[PDB]
Symmetry: C3
Subunit: 663 residues, 3 copies
């Protein structure tokens, strides 16, 4: 075969994982929405793509969401000019679908499990309570002159009221723009200025992992350079003294106390913007309303097999698209219970996730490979002595999951009784693009497997621009047709949207990731196109080399970048982090580096073996867990003085250590 | 009989009452969009909801739909302060004037959800001013024309309106109210008011501030006599009424309440001539001069005078002149009133309201309610709680209901009703503390009662 | 014999009735007419559209013709007296959705606009997809400026195809566009920009017309010096030549639109929400306001029936979008019907007088719609420019703007139509929204110079202006009035409803007053013969301008004429005639004094002794508006010695012509 699976210590013949009994309708669990095999996935998927898929999408849109006005047209527009339309004539409101309609059915049902930074302060928030808070905030925003179509910046940490702030904007047709709490004043300023908002919602302080985030202090520094912001609504999360500017700044509780606990919903067109979400100039990805909401609702239902009484635990942050789609919009649109997790995976101890799961009997868990590798690094004593049997689906999002970490997830979090859904997508796709349906698909460690409903993906040969038909092909991932939750533009920069996604391969949407489809038709997304390394004509994905390195005992996490080489074009350079227990005296660093290189050579080939290996205490990462290989690539290339605004990455101090180790 | 008012009332209260209420809302009002949910929310947090997904317009229900059916029908019997100056105002004329004023307001930049203060005496154009605001989704705040400059200022400032509708002068009991003079005094300390629309009721010289002040007639003459109706959510606010606390009523529930009570408590019929002698500056004039009668498409009276001008026979002269079919007044006026040789036979119902209190023919209906209730809550049907009203007696010393008959305590309501006030403008905390906290789970009217007798 | 006579013609009356020709009979593979084949087929359908039982027809047509977001309940209400006309009031819709989206969803690649550039070689087809995308981009730009539903937006654009996108972007978001003829003076632009109180103006750097540059941005800058409310100007880069741009206020159309997505939601408009203000040229500028559903329905129905438009037709209205004709029969009517419409950027004589016909044969136009002034202009230029063309794709030729003299009607019929097209003489006004009286080409046998019969929904009569009373029967003459509102009637004059009532509704209470003299002949055909204010009363004989001007043009060498009245001690008024001759006419073989005698004799033979002009002035051209109306008021006041009280003539087609006329009279 030309395409190989991501390196794994398990033989390929023993590495296929059928839906386990918890996902077979056994063990008293709900029967899966799609099952029990691959063909059941294909039979339904075939209804969602192609020239006769309007019927399926029209029915799903009308069955899944409540509409004030019906639509007539299912879809129109396309990539070339960026005029994608779905259900254009219909009207709806996201807050109505995420709150009102469920409150009218079961007001006391839990909407949010609020897992506070300190475990003792966690509590359940009913749909009634969440709706009331959302309506109060919406009324406050209207009193500030916020109109349909106005942008509102949100700089809130992971307290449950973040959901109320999102949905209060959606309720009145405002466009919320959420910024990770803890982003520097500079990063906040750039995003507040770009969306041209006049109102900002924030906290006095945030709490995360027992640390205080001085949000109001950061807001005050940023707003000195944000001339349009005239109103700041400040949630009293900690109660510590913070500055408050007379007139501009008001307290959330004092303002909401003046307002009624119900607010009508603004009737939104399907294509009215729902939010702007900046990714790392800052790129404001814009999603509209109906198509995005439908995509998050359908993917949540089908990829995680969500049922009415499920308790869904997405442990990400609402500053990330993962939090937009699979904390707030998806779970609440489905009317189930969703977790707002305010802490870190290791506060107070690395048992936190699992204490949380057993306390609330979470039925699905969704996190990132960085968190899985972090907990794997800390040892099994924190997870082994838990129940965790309420879980039946474990999800991974953010980057390729190394098969080694996949197995740890499968073995310890799931006890070999959960389906693992490796979900590939992007901020720009709105909802999950490629993922196993857990009641249907037998999984391979490291493979997203098959495309979701409405996603028709192909592999293009970047040297020819042509689609590679069939299986056992490798290249760059593209999508053939629009899908309902695709981002509609980049805020006030449609040209950047067209040039980034629609022009590289005309006729297609360009994801920016390298991908392969193996002989069984499974899709493998193996890293960013910009991270590919070419050694003596061999094209290397980051995931395959990083997956080989972690097979060595004691390795916690690695990142590989290319460095120019006069004789091989590029050479692989690897940054490697070891588990805390690994003794760098019994195995001197030079001996360990040799073993790591040998391991890569045996599993991939000599061309992939790192020419140099740097042992570091940690890797530069974004708040969401992405490993910033561009930073490492520029440091190795001697361009460490031209890196840009890294002030809001997870730990800026790590960039200095890496610079020292390389020098 | 008892088995008639109680048989029907059982369908309007309790866990099976949504069916009755959905049918009446759909029979009684014209809707642009249908509702799905009948009711939601409750007293505790003040999130009462009725017909939330529906859309409608109060001006469409009080003017347009009747104008389309019978444009020449009299909407308002305008009984001027001088009896000789009275005249009938047709639904066509009222709708045209309402639309002109609505177009004037839009030309000032009044948007859906904006407050507009109204400082008008009892001339028929007061209805046009109310319904013009409702037509465009503005929130009118009516201020009784007998209020001083300070009381006017306080209410104008509290609601943050940018527009005020008033008159040059008012005429009541043969005397002149210097309304524009009072308005100018008030507006010296009202920094948000940018436009004043001044109805020329007397034509006597009054001060007018260039730019800020314009004449009603001259502004309306520039505008077309039709204006589209803003499609309002059932729970969009309809008006603020300061009682200073701004009692806020929403649209669909309030309008349904007034229309049903008017039809049942007063047994209205399509060609009736309903004469409520109250003032549009108070809820009685809101509900049973303007919104109740015009929603039903009947004829309503706008009485500009006093009970004793020119003489104490004025009420009975008015009833004989117009053949009024109902007469709704307070005991205060009915006691102050010269009634011997009058006919008064056209009257089918004599209503009383506002305080504890025909000659063998016209009925006597004693109606209890409050500004916060929107429409009549307890009354006899020609006593007995109205449809949707489930009231109980509670001992204040225990907070417990005094089940039975011969008990005495405070009056409370069990569940929300459609026309209940939804908040106190920008002071929801006061709304909850006043009405919802004294007896958790109940609505606290604030008066005593015993069995039903209202103390 | 008859009291009412046809407009003077050299063809005998018995040979002057033209039945629908074979191209309009469903033969030769042409589409079958929507109404046909005779007068009775028109009456049978027309009778459903007027009277007390016509709600059914109008409700069905409104629901069949337009896409609605919300249905209506009431068909019509209101009336003339107070100006509260309402049609389909409870319904909601959007004009851009009906003109773009619904057709784009059906056939995105169908041509929406044939853009005939000033230079023929630069012309191209603009698909519904491209037009919708550009409309959506502009709509998004306007929203980014804070334009809200109900805000006015001024448009000062020449006849480039993007003018349609600018109109429809305003309609898409519920803004009220106010389009001003490109080339109007800074003073005229200022007055209209200030009256509508807009805060946004859309224009070009420059326009191109007849090989000439229109300094649109320079004019805008001059005007905006006196327009304190305008905060944003969007400038279309039509030529790319250097023009001033004010930092902050002014932005380039292409740079702004490139930032925006190519789709924009449609604002759900009430039937009676204003769609546009259109200013017309005697006092202050008159902003005629049209609402949405009735206007759109009227333009859609008249286009379909008066021009017998079918799905694949290529409709060529050669007017300007600054004129109501361009509003209704370039943009809204044709695009609502989903067909192809022409945006003609040039003049009838650039590069040569063959332009119209080169255009028709190049694009295979199926209908042509222009004005008598253009027809008379091409007539004066000779037959070599039209004779050697095909023109067989045409089957309907339309004329709008003024009475068409039978002499010009025949030239149109003979050379443009080759006696195989139906001629539709369409009478209406800015204030009527859509065509009011016109032949239905598959049904009505035409008379040269007659509008013939009223359109669906139009119930018209003749009032004797000397009595104020309706004249019953046929063979009557007086002033035209309408008995009942129709869906596309103007709803007000912007912020001046009193002027609307006093101009149209007060002169003849109970009726709508058009302001034109009219006659209904013995066959019931309607003749619109000139403005009431232009009637000339000589010794008790009331003379219409059209009849005398039609008699004069029967003389060899006459190109165009205008007659006005001047007080006369012996006849009350006397006829004075301003005459333009063809360039080739030898004015020395026939001296000016000699020609006048022949003209007077011809008018006497054809009309009567009283109609002979008392004085005749030879002029090189006549004062005319941009749209072709002859400004007889200007001539009338000059003859009356009142040339110093003429008003704002800065924006007429040729202001210099007024100076010559003053000289000739002096
Ligand atoms: C949802 C959230 C992660 O979106 P973004 O923050 O916009 O980042 C999107 C980018 O992340 C990477 N990626 C995310 N998931 C996976 C996965 N399962 N397998 C492989 N690569 C994955 C890709 O490079 C993608 O372009
Ligand atoms: C409708 C209008 C009067 O409302 P408000 O002006 O808010 O005053 C309401 C208050 O008036 C008094 N009341 C009203 N009706 C009656 C009645 N039938 N018998 C005895 N007392 C009555 C009560 O104290 C009530 O709470
Ligand atoms: C549509 C556009 C021309 O409207 P306006 O520019 O408002 O001018 C309207 C005026 O033009 C004249 N008129 C237009 N058409 C004809 C015609 N066929 N026969 C005779 N007179 C006609 C009339 O005097 C009309 O009042």
């Amino acid at each position: 075969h030309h395409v190989h699976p991501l390196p794994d210590s398990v033989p390929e013949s023993e590495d296929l994982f059928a839906p386990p009994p918890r996902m077979q309708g056994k063990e008293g669990r709900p029967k899966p929405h799609i099952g029990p095999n691959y063909e059941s996935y294909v039979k339904e998927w075939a209804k969602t793509v192609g020239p006769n898929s309007d019927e399926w999408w029209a029915a799903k849109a009308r069955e899944t969401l409540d509409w004030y006005d019906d639509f007539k047209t299912v879809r129109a527009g396309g990539f070339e000019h960026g005029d994608v339309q779905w259900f254009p004539e219909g009207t709806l409101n996201a807050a109505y679908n995420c709150l009102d309609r469920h409150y009218y059915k079961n007001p006391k049902k839990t909407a949010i499990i609020y897992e506070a930074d300190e475990p003792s302060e966690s509590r359940e928030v009913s749909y009634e309570e969440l709706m009331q808070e959302t309506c109060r905030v919406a009324n406050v925003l209207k009193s500030y002159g916020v109109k349909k179509g106005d942008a509102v910046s949100i700089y809130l940490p992971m307290t449950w009221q973040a959901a109320a702030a999102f949905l209060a904007c959606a309720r009145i047709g405002a466009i919320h723009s959420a910024v990770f709490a803890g982003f520097s004043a500079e990063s906040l300023r750039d995003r507040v200025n770009d969306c041209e908002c006049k109102v900002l919602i924030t906290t006095d302080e945030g709490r995360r992992g027992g640390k205080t985030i001085a949000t109001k202090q950061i807001v005050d520094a940023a707003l000195q350079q944000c001339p349009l912001v005239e109103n700041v609504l400040v949630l009293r999360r900690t109660g510590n003294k913070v500055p408050m500017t007379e007139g501009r700044d008001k307290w959330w509780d004092e303002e909401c106390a003046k307002m009624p606990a119900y607010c009508p919903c603004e009737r939104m067109a399907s294509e009215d913007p729902l939010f702007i979400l900046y990714t790392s100039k800052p790129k404001g990805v814009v999603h509209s309303t109906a198509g995005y909401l439908l995509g998050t609702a359908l993917t949540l239902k089908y990829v995680f097999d969500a049922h009415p009484d499920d308790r869904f635990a997405c442990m990400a942050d609402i500053g990330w698209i993962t939090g937009h789609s699979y904390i707030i919009y998806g779970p609440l649109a489905n009317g189930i219970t969703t977790a707002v997790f305010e802490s870190t995976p290791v506060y107070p101890t690395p048992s936190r996730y699992w204490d949380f799961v057993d306390k609330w009997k979470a039925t699905q868990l969704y996190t990132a490979p960085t968190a899985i590798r972090l907990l794997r690094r800390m040892g099994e004593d924190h997870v082994k002595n838990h129940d965790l049997s309420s879980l039946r689906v474990l999800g991974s999002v953010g980057e390729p999951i190394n098969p080694e970490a996949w197995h740890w997830y499968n073995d310890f979090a799931g006890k070999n009784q959960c389906a693992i859904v490796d979900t590939y997508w992007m901020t720009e796709t709105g909802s999950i693009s490629i993922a196993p349906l857990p009641g249907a698909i037998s999984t391979k460690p490291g493979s997203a497997t098959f495309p979701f409903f409405g996603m028709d993906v192909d592999i293009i040969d970047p040297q020819t621009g042509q689609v590679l038909e069939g299986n056992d092909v490798e290249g760059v991932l593209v999508a053939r047709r629009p899908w309902p939750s695709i981002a509609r533009t980049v805020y006030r920069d449609h040209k950047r949207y067209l040039e980034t996604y629609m022009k590289p391969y005309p006729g297609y949407f360009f994801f920016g990731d390298g991908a392969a489809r193996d002989y069984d038709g499974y899709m493998w997304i193996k890293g960013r196109v910009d991270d590919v390394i070419n050694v003596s004509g061999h094209r290397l994905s980051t995931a395959e080399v990083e997956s080989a390195l972690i097979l060595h005992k004691g390795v916690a996490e690695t990142a590989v970048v290319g460095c120019a080489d006069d004789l091989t074009g590029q050479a692989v350079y690897a940054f490697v982090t070891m588990k805390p227990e690994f003794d760098l005296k019994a195995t001197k660093e030079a001996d360990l580096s040799k073993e790591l290189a040998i391991q890569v050579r045996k599993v991939i080939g000599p061309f992939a073996a790192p020419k140099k290996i740097y042992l570091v205490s940690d890797l530069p990462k974004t708040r969401s867990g992405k490993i910033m290989r561009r930073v490492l690539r520029k440091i190795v290339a001697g361009e460490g003085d031209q890196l840009g605004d890294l002030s809001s990455i997870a730990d800026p101090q790590i960039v200095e250590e890496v610079k020292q180790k390389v020098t």
